[PDB]
């Protein structure tokens, strides 16, 4: 996997897919000069650093090559930065589970848990802390295959850095580990906490965590030992994996490699672990 530098004439925006503080993402078409191959892509136009700085960050990003991380294919530098990425035709997993809640079986849910853990383990191998894992930031390539994506919060740790120490950026409190809320500290193990919340989202078919509760109250609820409730479809075995992800001691939490093993075992006999009517 290598970074391609695109000229504006190489790609076209077709329609908007979504928008946020990061910028806007479009469905588009990329035709590399004289290659005659038409590639469906997502184009993320970000809302300055030197061009070489941006290209360097894009090079590292483009080297992230794993079946369960959405890949940067190329970049175009003009008045704006435009990132050309793999298109995930089914959109964010949050909306997908909300839409198809009555037609999603245990096999798909547990498989997604495995896949997200595989992608996160790869990011950890690359020394990348994601810092924004949530169902909204997982994308659906096919119903059978999902990929993690990133909107600017991910950080590369230095050879001797064990944690990332954040500053004033806005934070997704309800997905964060307690140590991140209290001390602005982020690690692969705080990503594990977020992974647990992400799994809870999937198992509740996209429900809102700590629904209706002010973000300002969350740290106090967590300090009292309270956590997100057991989803209706979850046997206690699955809920206990979530609860392990939210233990106060970061080193008490499972690592992604362990999560891959545990969810993979469950995915072999999915109906023993999730209880879904009509499944199957
Ligand atoms: C739930 C989060 C959300 O809606 N985020 C938006 C969508 N984003 C995004 N979307 C796609 N693909 C997509 C979405 N829809 C409705 N249709 C499609 O494709 C036909 C995508 N592919 C790759 N990347 C990076 C994507 N991002 C991100 C936010 F804009």
UniProtKB/Swiss-Prot annotation:
Changing residue 18 to S: Found in a lung cancer sample; somatic mutation; strongly increased kinase activity; constitutively activated kinase with higher levels of basal autophosphorylation; more sensitive to gefitinib than wild-type. It is found in: Cell membrane; Endoplasmic reticulum membrane; Golgi apparatus membrane; Nucleus membrane. Changing residue 63 to I: Found in a lung cancer sample; constitutively activated kinase with higher levels of basal autophosphorylation; more sensitive to gefitinib than wild-type. Changing residue 4 to A: Abolishes phosphorylation. The active site is at residue 132. Binding of the ligand triggers homo- and/or heterodimerization of the receptor triggering its autophosphorylation. Heterodimer with ERBB2. Forms a complex with CCDC88A/GIV (via SH2-like regions) and GNAI3 which leads to enhanced EGFR signaling and triggering of cell migration; binding to CCDC88A requires autophosphorylation of the EGFR C-terminal region, and ligand stimulation is required for recruitment of GNAI3 to the complex. Interacts with ERRFI1; inhibits dimerization of the kinase domain and autophosphorylation. Part of a complex with ERBB2 and either PIK3C2A or PIK3C2B. This is Epidermal growth factor receptor. The chain holds residues 702 to 985 of 1210 of the full protein.
């Amino acid at each position: 996997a290598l970074l391609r530098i695109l000229k504006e004439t190489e790609f076209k925006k077709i329609k908007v897919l979504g928008s946020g503080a990061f910028g806007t993402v479009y469905k588009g078409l990329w035709i590399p000069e004289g290659e005659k191959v038409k590639i469906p892509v997502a184009i993320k136009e970000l809302r300055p650093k030197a061009n070489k700085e941006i290209l360097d960050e894009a090079y590292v990003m483009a080297s992230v090559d794993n079946p369960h991380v959405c890949r940067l294919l190329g970049i175009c530098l003009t008045s704006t930065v435009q990132l050309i990425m793999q298109l995930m035709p089914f959109g964010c997993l949050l909306d997908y589970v909300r839409e198809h809640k009555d037609n999603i079986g245990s096999q798909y849910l547990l498989n997604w848990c495995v896949q997200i853990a595989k992608g996160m383990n790869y990011l950890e191998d690359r020394r990348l802390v994601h810092r924004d894992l949530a169902a909204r930031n997982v994308l659906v390539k096919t119903p059978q295959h999902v990929k993690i994506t990133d909107f600017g919060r991910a950080k590369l740790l230095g050879a001797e850095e064990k944690e990332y120490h954040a500053e004033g950026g806005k934070v997704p409190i309800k997905w964060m580990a307690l140590e991140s809320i209290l001390h602005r500290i982020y690690t692969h193990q705080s990503d594990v906490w977020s992974y647990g919340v992400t799994v809870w989202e999937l198992m509740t078919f996209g429900s809102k965590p700590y629904d209706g509760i002010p973000a300002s109250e969350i740290s106090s609820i967590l300090e009292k030992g309270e956590r997100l409730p057991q989803p209706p479809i979850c046997t206690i075995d699955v809920y206990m994996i979530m609860r392990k992800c939210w233990m106060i001691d970061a080193d008490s939490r499972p690592k992604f490699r362990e999560l891959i093993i545990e969810f993979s075992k469950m995915a072999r006999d999915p109906q023993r672990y999730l209880v879904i009517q009509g499944d199957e």
